[PDB]
Amino acid sequence: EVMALKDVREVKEENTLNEKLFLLACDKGDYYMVKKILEENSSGDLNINCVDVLGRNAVTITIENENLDILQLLLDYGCQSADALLVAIDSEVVGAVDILLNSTTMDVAPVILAAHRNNYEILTMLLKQDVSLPKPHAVGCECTLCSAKNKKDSLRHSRFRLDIYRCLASPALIMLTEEDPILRAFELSADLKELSLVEVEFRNDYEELARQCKMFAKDLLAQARNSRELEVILNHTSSMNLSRLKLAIKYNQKEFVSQSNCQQFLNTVWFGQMSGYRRKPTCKKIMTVLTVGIFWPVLSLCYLIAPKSQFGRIIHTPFMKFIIHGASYFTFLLLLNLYSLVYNEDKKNTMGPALERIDYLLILWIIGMIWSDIKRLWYEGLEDFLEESRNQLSFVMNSLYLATFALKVVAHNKFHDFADRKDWDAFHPTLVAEGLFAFANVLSYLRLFFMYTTSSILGPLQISMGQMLQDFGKFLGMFLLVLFSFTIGLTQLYDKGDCVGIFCEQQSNDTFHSFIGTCFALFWYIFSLAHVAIFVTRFSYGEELQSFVGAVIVGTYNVVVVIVLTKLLVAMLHKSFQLIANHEDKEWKFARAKLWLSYFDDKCTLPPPFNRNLKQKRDENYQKVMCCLVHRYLTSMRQKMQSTDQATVENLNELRQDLSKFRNEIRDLL
Amino acid sequence: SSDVDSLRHSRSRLNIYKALASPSLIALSSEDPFLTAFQLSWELQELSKVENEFKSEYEELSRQCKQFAKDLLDQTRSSRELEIILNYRDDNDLARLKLAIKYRQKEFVAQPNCQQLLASRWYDEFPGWRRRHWAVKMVTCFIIGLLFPVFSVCYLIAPKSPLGLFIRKPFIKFICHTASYLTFLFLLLLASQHDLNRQGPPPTIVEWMILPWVLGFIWGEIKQMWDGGLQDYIHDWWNLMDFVMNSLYLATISLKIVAFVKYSNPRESWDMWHPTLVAEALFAIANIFSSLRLISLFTANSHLGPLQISLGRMLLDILKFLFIYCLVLLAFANGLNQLYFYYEETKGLTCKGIRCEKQNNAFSTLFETLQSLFWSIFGLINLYVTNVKAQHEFTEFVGATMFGTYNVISLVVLLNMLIAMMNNSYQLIADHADIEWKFARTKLWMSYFEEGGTLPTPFNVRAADNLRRHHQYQEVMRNLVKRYVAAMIRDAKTEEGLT
Amino acid sequence: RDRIPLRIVRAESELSPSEKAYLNAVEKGDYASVKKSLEEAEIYFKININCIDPLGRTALLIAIENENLELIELLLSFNVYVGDALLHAIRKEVVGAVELLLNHQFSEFTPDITPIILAAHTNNYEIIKLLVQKGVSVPRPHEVRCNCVECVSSSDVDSLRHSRSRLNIYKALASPSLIALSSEDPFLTAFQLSWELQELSKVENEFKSEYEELSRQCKQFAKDLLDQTRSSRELEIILNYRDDLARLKLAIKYRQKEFVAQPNCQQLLASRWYDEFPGWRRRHWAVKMVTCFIIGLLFPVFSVCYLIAPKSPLGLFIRKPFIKFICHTASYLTFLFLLLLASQDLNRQGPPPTIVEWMILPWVLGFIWGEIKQMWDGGLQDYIHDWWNLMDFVMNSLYLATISLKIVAFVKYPRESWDMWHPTLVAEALFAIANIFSSLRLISLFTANSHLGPLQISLGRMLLDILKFLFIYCLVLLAFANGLNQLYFYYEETLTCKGIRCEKQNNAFSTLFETLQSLFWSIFGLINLYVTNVKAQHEFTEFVGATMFGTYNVISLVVLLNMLIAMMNNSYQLIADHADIEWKFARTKLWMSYFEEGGTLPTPFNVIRRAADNLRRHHQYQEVMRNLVKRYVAAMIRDAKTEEGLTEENFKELKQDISSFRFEVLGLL
Ligand SMILES: CCCCCCCCCCCCCCCC(=O)OC[C@H](COP(=O)(O)O)OC(=O)CCCCCCCCCCCCCCC
Ligand SMILES: CCCCCCCCCCCCCCCC(=O)OC[C@H](COP(=O)(O)O)OC(=O)CCCCCCCCCCCCCCC
Ligand SMILES: CCCCCCCCCCCCCCCC(=O)OC[C@H](COP(=O)(O)O)OC(=O)CCCCCCCCCCCCCCC
Ligand SMILES: CC(C)CCC[C@@H](C)[C@H]1CC[C@H]2[C@@H]3CC=C4C[C@@H](OC(=O)CCC(=O)O)CC[C@]4(C)[C@H]3CC[C@]12C
Ligand SMILES: CC(C)CCC[C@@H](C)[C@H]1CC[C@H]2[C@@H]3CC=C4C[C@@H](OC(=O)CCC(=O)O)CC[C@]4(C)[C@H]3CC[C@]12C
Ligand SMILES: [Ca+2]
Ligand SMILES: [Ca+2]
Ligand SMILES: [Zn+2]
Ligand SMILES: [Zn+2]
Description:
3 chains, binds calcium ion, calcium channel (chain B), ion channel (chain B), membrane (chain B), Short transient receptor potential channel 4 (chain B), transmembrane helix (chain B)
């Protein structure tokens, strides 16, 4: 028993010896016997289109060898091309492509393949002729044209769309045919990201194309020499304001923002006229921060009285504006803290209390904060407001504050009978008002987290935790399902059975007598700190089987949560933090730039408590700077391909081909 | 220039510093390439601190300068050349080694040749100690440990005697200092072992010979602060710990003499701010700090050394996460205090707080709320502390929900985040554990190289020569630079990547 | 001065333009120009033969690094002075080393480097063979821990030079080519060299990574030399060679984890493990556990048959190492079942129960006799080098203590009216501790299994790291216990219970021992918060003590436990890449424990012509080694010119060769 190997499919036909001689002389550069064989071909002894073992014709063989003279000789004898231009384009040589203008999947073109290989000279000499590429449809287009080609060949339609978007996302085509390469890179990265979101099967290619566009935009920004052209590119309006930087923030260009030139420009705009703060010692820095933060209402009122002069100019600096806003929020938190100390004046027994001075201060403070939030809604969109978590947290905190003050004034108007607090009902409006006040205090002090993004030490850590909270959500779903299952089981088993529940000195068996009680009891089992003792799993009338089964169920739940799920969460956090920490600086710089751009504008200056010829000249300046950046980028990147690309086996084969050419020339001459 | 063009100025400064920090220019055109590399790495580190942008460029330039200094030290093929290099001063001192430690050259210091030189100067007149059997080493170290005071009084009465010169060996001096500190901790342990006195004098068995040791520690810290400045004193965390413990010991001594000459009665009837009680509490805290200073001795050992160094490196990340946890804790503490301070009661209770058998008034004040939320990490706060005596189920539910939210956010979220983040930190810092451990161990070694401060704590209380030194150092630098540029060309033409 | 004036500090004598053009003619490959320059150098002109470049590049050196043999022969034909040019040809691995050898300041090499040392450093088989044929000698290094007069004199003169020379000598000896060419037994040489280099890395704290890399190189060379076996006859010749598997025992002794855990070695060990068992592993798992249980219940009949008839087929079935492993496992399981039966009282003297404990004693005496017998052969170093031997020594000492205490209580002596140090109570406590150790000894049997094996090996490997972190935590605990006892010993009250082991925990920090226990039990949360309170109303003392307790809890739980988790993460990631190698080494040790004929009986029953042969074995081993060395040399030569890649040196060689051909063509026409 031995398998006998046989060639199932015929691929190479030998036929006569002249075809093999032509194939052997094609990959050896033997010019004179090649022209003799071509003269015999003109006589008619052999066929020009010869298929070898590799399936490559003589034109393909001489294109792989990158030889122009013998290729010109082949073209002068009327050889069949058969998409040899694509093969010459893929081998990335100028001469073969320009002499062809004098397998591969059918949806591509010479322009598409030239953009795929990212060859600037091949693209710029294929763009001398008029070339138009088919405009792809939008990511939400479902017209009859899009509903007819997919039925015929969905795979061909998807590959054609991917090839079109890969041709458009090439850097060299962005240089050659677009007025604004920066805006084209931004919009193309956004479109490729939303295509990766939509096209779930091909999301890796679209993601890498979006990354390629973003890297191209970053490395195009990196070619700026002086700060004048940097302010030219970063203030351009498509049709001071920093419109292009705002567009880069909007289009999630994290690499563009975290560029050192852009970061230095952001620092210079952010510190304003106080450029010596960066070179100041640390003690002077804390002293400056403390001095600007202590007399913040003086600066605010002095800007309110006279904005034009120098005392209204220091607040106009976004760094001092941010410090004033931070001190404003800190004294708001101080008022929240002092509410408890002020309120201890026998006002804990009144049904509807009279509002103190702190209450009037706090209602003024949250009216100012609500007005600031309303201004942010009216100025910069709605969905982008919902994107950022501080805005949602502040909206919920302000809603809770509004409900608190509404319930407080309702209780003051209606419930104004003095009594003791022990005799009140559970759902009295005052109690609900103070509960929502406690929740709003929690959220107000938790809103201090997003002032960490401007710190160089606590910034990237907070950004990493905010990035890794999605792992907690995705695992929270699974834990909620497991908790629901064990809650159903324990409630079903234990429903047959003063202070009731687990919030007692002696936690009775009645904690498992209800569904919400069972969820409460199994919720305090996660921490493994004996918050719910094991005698709550004992029946009150000595049912040993049911109590033991409940104890086994609780033990299985404790194993599955504590010893399995918590360690799994630790492992997923390990992988997430190892992936996240590679680019934590870039995300921190992007978030800090967003926080700085939130303070750059002059429309929201005062803190929460106190609250054509020019277009053509700009277009000409931007076009000149863009042409300079294009030239610098092209020379730089061609230096990188000449200096960093490693040699291949094809280079060695080409060197052997040149050596055999010289050997054959010496043989023929001598 | 910055007002006219800041980007051009920054690029020009970076280009100039890139040109100056190149190894070839320093090897070709600098008088002292080692001093140039050290100072250049210092300026590039300071510029990376100042220039927030281009921080990676200046850090890479500083690392390149340090790597060049390490390679220039690598070309020493004789011990005479190494002794010329390490002892050179610009104006057996090891002045250049001290300069490299000052400029934080971990790779230069942890080079094996100067490591061997420092080990030879460490085991002074110790034939074959590095190859001895381990329990024999332990027995001999124990023997020298019990014999610290006889060597100390031998150095007191006869420094020229061989017995008085045995303490001049740095390893023997370190052993005697560690034995002294162990005797101090033994006296601290004996202080607790084996009153109603309002004006209790120090007992003669233990506390009377504790006082001269405290004076010796204070005088040693003062001498260390004088000789070296205050910047290097605040750079070391162990010096800060020693200063804290000496301040606590001085406060304990002052409170004891105050309670002796004033406020001269059963123990249970004393004031809660009685000076004797404050003195005992500060003595206990100082005892904790004194016994926690023993972890600094782990650096000498080759097994616990890198581990202790890695834990010290991760302490900074510990504090960085503790800031975030403290913000969370203040948030939830103010929320629970605002919810629960209306239900504050006395009721004739002997207890008010979370620190007894019946836990009550957990969130009545902000201090008690902070304490109760602090002890919820370790699960020492029971679930009934969120209950009020009134029949207000809504406020009890809100308090239980906020307590559970705080418990989740701390224990499930932030503790596991901290576990993953220190996992990554220990993965990052274990690659370079050996060089930082060797740097810290060499700092510990030349802490004992100087002649001053030889005694342990209880007993502690011209032109032609310089010209020939410059000629010798210049000839050694010529040989080292020639070898380095030769190796640079060798390694450079054997770069395994072909473009 | 606002500008830095750059000047050359280390200036040289430079070169004349004629000498610079002559060096350029050396570089490019103008044979006619260097010949004309040399002919002009014979007469009294500016150009001298022994010129020195500012970079230290003599014309012979730059001729050598351009791989132009004609140029090298041209300079040696006119008696150009030769210094360390042979070393430059050796380091470049250039075939002109022959011309440098037959041919009759600043040096880029250390003065202790000789041609054979550098050729062994470069690991070139051809140059090493050439130098050994010419006749070379490496100086013999001394012992690892020696104190002769020469070593201490050289250390007093130059410790750096002595250490560098010793490292260079050991780098030369540890090269695979020198062992393959000049050693009588390459396997023994590699084993002893790796052992010596490991001891040197332990002794020399500096250059430790160099010696560890050299030891790893020796082990890796031994593994590759064993990898060239083509027949099982050659493998049995190699492994059973002595000057029975003597060489495998030697490789286990020298910690050669890569020589073992090789598929051929593991195949031979599995063939000797399931001896006369055709297709054992190619069976369903259920049948395997069924027949394992059948052998397990049938342990005493096989033991009795071995004790009464070793030549019987049933008396030879126990002689199979796998069957005797199952027999020993069944014996230990039956002993543990007897311990469990013993775990399931008013007499001061406790006689053994008439059923349970009486047959337990033969297992105890069998374990003791086996431990003494195993300690007698092999030595005491390998006894203390195995932690399971420490564990069962502790268990046997505890069992002997229980036996002696039971005897003392029988010959000398209600339960509630006994002294706390009654010999019966101490005997029962030590019996329970010994039961813990005996039942914890079962983890050593996980090495045979292929699933729990590597896991058990890795989790036993990180125990040294566990001990280091436990040392650090013990220091922290001692500090905080000292402080808390110092604060709280003034408030000691004297109440049936006094300690933390009752319902109302009291006097937790009143005693130093109790403070240690209270701080130990606070990791698991078993110490409540009322232990920090005192009877008096001293709120400051209570607050300071509770702050100490909180700081200790914060350290030992948030800080120290997470540092421990991080360092177990790093250790496990470091040791999981070799888990198969260590597991197979430990499984080989477990197998070869049962391979020997001695100790066949389980512990309940274990207490009851030559010169011609040696010459033939040596000749067979030398022939097998010659074939293996030839195969290894050919393989590493074929490996050597494939995975090396292309540097800039070979591109410069291509440029110089093409330029030389161009200039020769120009000279022809
Ligand atoms: C500012 C940034 C802070 C750090 C980032 C915080 C992100 C959000 C944190 C999670 C969301 C808030 C807590 C939600 C839980 C809550 O409020 O829960 C609070 C309440 C407490 O009720 P009782 O106190 O009455 O029992 O829980 C319940 O009502 C029980 C029924 C619902 C159970 C939900 C449990 C969610 C899972 C939480 C633990 C997951 C463990 C996973 C590891 C095994
Ligand atoms: C939901 C997806 C995630 C989970 C997927 C499944 C994985 C987890 C499967 C758990 C299966 C049940 C576990 C056993 C619970 C149980 O038997 O608990 C049941 C009983 C408890 O009885 P009482 O509750 O009456 O005391 O356990 C016993 O009787 C004691 C002896 C058996 C002990 C078994 C322990 C198994 C290992 C669990 C602890 C691991 C700790 C490791 C520390 C390093
Ligand atoms: C041994 C060398 C290595 C370790 C070096 C030290 C590193 C750790 C330093 C910790 C310093 C002590 C911190 C305060 C502890 C204390 O005594 O705190 C004790 C007190 C409680 O007092 P009582 O015990 O009297 O009630 O805490 C408070 O007063 C509440 C307000 C302060 C809370 C500070 C909390 C800081 C963070 C600590 C917990 C972090 C958990 C994070 C979970 C996600
Ligand atoms: C309650 C009191 C008595 C303290 C109890 C613990 C001490 C006896 C231990 C704890 C840590 C130990 C130290 C840990 C590490 C070292 C390093 C080691 O010495 C060296 O490595 C010296 C340098 C070298 O060999 O290169 C042995 C001594 C010493 C100081 C140890 C001395 C004994 C110490 C202080
Ligand atoms: C309470 C008492 C009875 C102990 C209860 C547990 C034992 C019955 C178990 C625990 C671990 C088990 C061992 C775990 C691993 C193995 C290896 C496995 O055998 C092999 O893998 C042999 C080698 C091979 O197959 O290549 C099966 C037997 C054995 C010793 C097992 C025998 C049965 C043991 C001792
Ligand atoms: Ca100090
Ligand atoms: Ca044993
Ligand atoms: Zn469409
Ligand atoms: Zn010797």
